[PDB]
Amino acid sequence: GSLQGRVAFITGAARGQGRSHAVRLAAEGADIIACDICAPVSASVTYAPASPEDLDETARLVEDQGRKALTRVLDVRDDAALRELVADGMEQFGRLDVVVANAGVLSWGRVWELTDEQWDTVIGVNLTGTWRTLRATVPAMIEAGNGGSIVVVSSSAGLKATPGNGHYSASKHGLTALTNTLAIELGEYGIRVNSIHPYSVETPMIEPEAMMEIFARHPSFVHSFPPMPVQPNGFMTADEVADVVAWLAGDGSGTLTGTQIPVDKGALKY
Amino acid sequence: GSLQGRVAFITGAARGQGRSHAVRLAAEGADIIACDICAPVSASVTYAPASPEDLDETARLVEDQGRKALTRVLDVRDDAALRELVADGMEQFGRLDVVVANAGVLSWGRVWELTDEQWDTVIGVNLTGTWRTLRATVPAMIEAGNGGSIVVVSSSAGLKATPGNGHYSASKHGLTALTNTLAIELGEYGIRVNSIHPYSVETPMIEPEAMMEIFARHPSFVHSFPPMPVQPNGFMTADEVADVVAWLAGDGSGTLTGTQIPVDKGALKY
């Protein structure tokens, strides 16, 4: 496979896109270090939470590919827990080639109506939590000496801010900037850093209830959420997003660092 | 008198660019609500801090333009302080036409070498603090019913992330997103929201030794910091930045909302 004998570290791997990346990267030959908070993060995040069962199942799916999975329940806002998982992973697998910084949360409210808890939770998990993930993994990837590839999961909202979630758009634009700063800073080490910007991926993060409420109260907001030109009905799958991550993780994308890749089937073109 | 009889609320107004905006908007006719921490923000911010004398100085300069100045020492991370200043300001002036969210801080370190204090300070002042400023002022502007103009001070690093300051670049990209989400959400209220992206402005924030050290350690980082094509030697002034803020604040820029204006004499073109 394109990743035979390599090792990837993936956050938010309990379900959804994170699980898809873990399984796909395993299918490509990588052993997997995977973590997820496996719990509701906040009263302000109103869709269904991931469970520890979900993470165990990612691990079974990785093992089904003939690979090894080290999994752990942790919060990416918990620096000590991240350091320890990285250390345990390096002891078990001995190298670190791919990082997928994927854990995130979403909530909704107009900028001046957002609460402290809404703000702090989204900025804290999405932006600070990603930074902590990067700070914990980068030294191990440098020390391993094999170069590497880091994929930061931003959002289409990380390139074009959307109404009703300025805190989420801010967190995700912040991720675009981290990706690009880190691409410059890690160039000399042979480590590439790129970001993906998905749209309309069918996971529990998309709460149809929340969207209907937003468009009910502010009908003009619909103009920020158009159909996808090459798939004008319904949603893309988490596995489809994993096609992009697999390619970025491997040598086929050796010419890309600092790129913002929209995974949106054309929606950002409208 | 492009702003005759109007009221502007400005953060970080003790000195530097914030001072220049206060005095200019005053000379255009606006009375001024202005605030600043007037103290060191963090050991991690190594250049000289502003003083309470600086903010009194801004107040006197505004008064010399024939206008009123309400000033206060507060931290933009202190929500109650912000709310109280907005309330006292509305009591005194009865309207709010312009917000210039200008308070900010800078420090330097590669992404994986940043400390919790460096990160938390930059994200908390620049991103969260700006959000708190917007949340505290937007409802007064809506209630006044005269529409208005909000200027968010981002940076050239909020459009093109730079090496050695990923936290700062993230904070300022986050501000780009806040500007654009807010522009959409406030359009129906007749309030325009735009961001400026300065480069090389002569204020204490760019005392040169930090940058000298960064380049000495990481020589390749110089490529991210080119000359300004229309001023290839030296620095732009804080009063030059206030020309742009003055035009965005007033009606001459009525066709602009959601725009990112580089104030860089062309440096972003390189």
Add this chain to the structure above:
Amino acid sequence: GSLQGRVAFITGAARGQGRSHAVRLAAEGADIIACDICAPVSASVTYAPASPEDLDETARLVEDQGRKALTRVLDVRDDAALRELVADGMEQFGRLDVVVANAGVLSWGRVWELTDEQWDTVIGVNLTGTWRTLRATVPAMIEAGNGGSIVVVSSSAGLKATPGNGHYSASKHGLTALTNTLAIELGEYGIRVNSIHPYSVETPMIEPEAMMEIFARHPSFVHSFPPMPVQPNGFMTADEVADVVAWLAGDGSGTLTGTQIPVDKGALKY
């Protein structure tokens, strides 16, 4: 006035936006060199053409501002005619401070359905014609030695390409590039170069029959043409576009070169 004693050269000045710039820059104190083809460009351009009477009217409006107008019927694709008008303008006024490259045409068709005529006309007037305008005017501005400001009229379709007019979108993206290349090349001469990107300006170019037909045949294209957030009904006026041009033309925008200014009341945010 902000442009007192200065001289501006404006193309497509017979009506619409170009007329509004001519009259506005005259009100600011500038003398005006104004030109327009005053004729239908092509059978492929289906809205009403400008007439010589239109250009004489622009001249009368300039003269009512107390300023002088040199006007000339010419085609921006005609190099000799451009060179001759620049020369006559320098003989009359002895200087050249502002250039507004505004002449433009529009037609509609899907990429693979466009005719040679449709393509050649739009590329030829918009992209090549603007280039000829800059080549003919830039040497005179340099020679005069007072620095200057050049405004290139692109479109929102010069930043975000639209369906049904790939030729026009390509021409206007070409103008964004020309603006930026020229800004770098002219920096050393003290000449600023910026582009404006309007949307939904009420001129004959936007007679609604063509757009109505495009939408009826290709209904999904409607997603590319959202409302303006701060003006969700109707169109902006040519005089409103002239507010931005006037500011760019003068010293208040001395910190801007190489900037792309959307004049769209927020529409590109959606």
Add this chain to the structure above:
Amino acid sequence: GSLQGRVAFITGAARGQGRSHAVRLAAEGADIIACDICAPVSASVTYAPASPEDLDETARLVEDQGRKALTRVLDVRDDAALRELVADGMEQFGRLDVVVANAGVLSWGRVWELTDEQWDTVIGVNLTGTWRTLRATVPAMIEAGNGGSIVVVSSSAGLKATPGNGHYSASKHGLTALTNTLAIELGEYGIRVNSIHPYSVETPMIEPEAMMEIFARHPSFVHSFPPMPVQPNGFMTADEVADVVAWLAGDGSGTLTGTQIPVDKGALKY
């Protein structure tokens, strides 16, 4: 292989990037239609031209992959030649799945110093010739009814214009626009359209002598041409660009349409 039983049409296939794409897509299992002017395009293009022999070598390299090659000497500016090659191609192969519009030329000069020959050659080949290529191929792809993937070769200068070649930067920005217009127009047909933006690729197009002449006269222009952060010395190869084209051509990129992919090893981040 990923493109087994499919057909790809490639322009500029005599050598350099175009040859790399033809041989790679053949290795993935596609039969090839390939064409090239195999002659000097213009006195204004000063580096060595491709030869008919170059194109025959490409054909052999395709046949070595065990695939069929239909090749033809033609100018992409020549519409009848394109239609006839497309027609012969469909008769021979029966379908058309991938188009790589790669033919291009480069020359150098400041905007107001460019000759008519310089301008007309670069716009005619790069912008108009690419348009003609798309207009000739898109109908055949639609009629075949299998969807498809179209790759437009722009340049880093199609994202960030460069000094000394405003005409080339304009032509390549125009290609960005064509890509995105076409992505919206072709979505309903299951045809994806994406653009690549390479930098520093080792082909005859990079003439060390012309660069040295440019920097000799205008030293400040060097700031637009930085090193590649993940390959700070030397050039990337044509085969490395072909990794990106092979991925875009195939189903692994099914989530991408309207994307601008920089192929620059990070250079655009500086």
